[PDB]
């Protein structure tokens, strides 16, 4: 359903952000 | 409908953030 | 209601973050 | 549970918003 | 599960909050 699919999309995108910010932390530290 | 529309707006904004943070990571990466 | 108000607060804060990360990208690289 | 979890998310996102503003301010002329 | 997905989002956002603080400390330190 539309609510479930949107929440899944949010969860996936937040995990992408978490991976990118970890890559930034690795480049800097 | 208000809940569906608001969480869609949140999803779109988070996708904007995901693109920008990747641009930042790439500029600083050797 | 509490759920509606919290989701509104989340949406507003994420928009603030999206603008700050765009300002970081602009300051670093334009 | 749902109300409390989304309140926790709202608070954590406000913490992130403060930290990202600190980063933006340090690098800005 | 809606509750479980929102809990997973809350956990990922807490990871992001920690990582961004580590980045801010390395840049400002």
Numbering used by the authors:
A (entry chain A): 1 to 29
B (entry chain D), C (entry chain E): 1 to 30
D (entry chain C), E (entry chain B): 2 to 30
Give verbatim lines from the article.
Our hypothesis was that these should direct larger and smaller oligomers, respectively. Encouragingly, the new Thr@g sequences consistently scored best as pentamers: for the a = d = Ile variant the pentameric assembly was favoured outright; while the a = Leu, d = Ile variant scored equally well as pentamer or hexamer. We determined X-ray protein crystal structures for all Gly@g and Thr@g variants. As predicted, the Thr@g peptides formed parallel pentamers. Significantly, Thr@g with a = d = Ile has a wider channel of ≈9 Å than previous designs (≈7 Å), which increases the scope to functionalize this variant.
